[PDB]
Coordinates of C-alpha atoms in Angstrom, one line a residue:
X1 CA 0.0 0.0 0.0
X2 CA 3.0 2.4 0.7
X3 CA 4.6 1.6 -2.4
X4 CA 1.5 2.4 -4.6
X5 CA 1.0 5.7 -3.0
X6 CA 4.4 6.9 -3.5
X7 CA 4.4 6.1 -6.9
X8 CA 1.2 7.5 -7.5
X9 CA 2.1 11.2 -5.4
X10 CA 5.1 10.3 -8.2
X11 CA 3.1 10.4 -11.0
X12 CA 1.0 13.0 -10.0
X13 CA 4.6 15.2 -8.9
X14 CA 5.6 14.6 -12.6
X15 CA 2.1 15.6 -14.3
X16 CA 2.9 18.8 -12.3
X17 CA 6.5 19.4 -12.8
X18 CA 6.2 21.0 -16.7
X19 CA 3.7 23.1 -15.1
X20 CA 5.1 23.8 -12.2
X21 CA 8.4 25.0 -14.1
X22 CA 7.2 26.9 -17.1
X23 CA 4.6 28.8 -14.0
X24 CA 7.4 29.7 -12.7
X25 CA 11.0 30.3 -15.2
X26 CA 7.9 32.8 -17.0
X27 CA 7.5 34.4 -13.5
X28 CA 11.5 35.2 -12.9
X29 CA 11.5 36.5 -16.7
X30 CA 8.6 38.5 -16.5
X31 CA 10.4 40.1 -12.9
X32 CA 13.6 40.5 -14.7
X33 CA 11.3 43.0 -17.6
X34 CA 9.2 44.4 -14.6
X35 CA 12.5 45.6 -12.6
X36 CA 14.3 46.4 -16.5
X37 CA 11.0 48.7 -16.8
X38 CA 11.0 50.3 -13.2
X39 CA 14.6 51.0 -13.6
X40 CA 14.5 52.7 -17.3
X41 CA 11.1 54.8 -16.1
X42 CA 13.6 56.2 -12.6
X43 CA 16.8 56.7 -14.8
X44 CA 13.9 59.0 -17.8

């Protein structure tokens, strides 16, 4: 019973890891833009 269940939360961890990792490498990159835009408005 203890081995189904971890490899089920496995399965479950891997149908979420694309996700999880495009939700979030698009997150940093749109903060990198956000802070690029915030810095370029104080400078004009």
């Amino acid at each position: 019973q203890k081995r189904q269940a971890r490899e089920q939360l496995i399965e479950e961890c891997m149908a979420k890891m694309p996700q999880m990792i495009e939700n979030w490498r698009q997150q940093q990159q749109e903060r990198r833009x956000x802070x690029x835009x915030x810095x370029x408005x104080x400078x004009x």
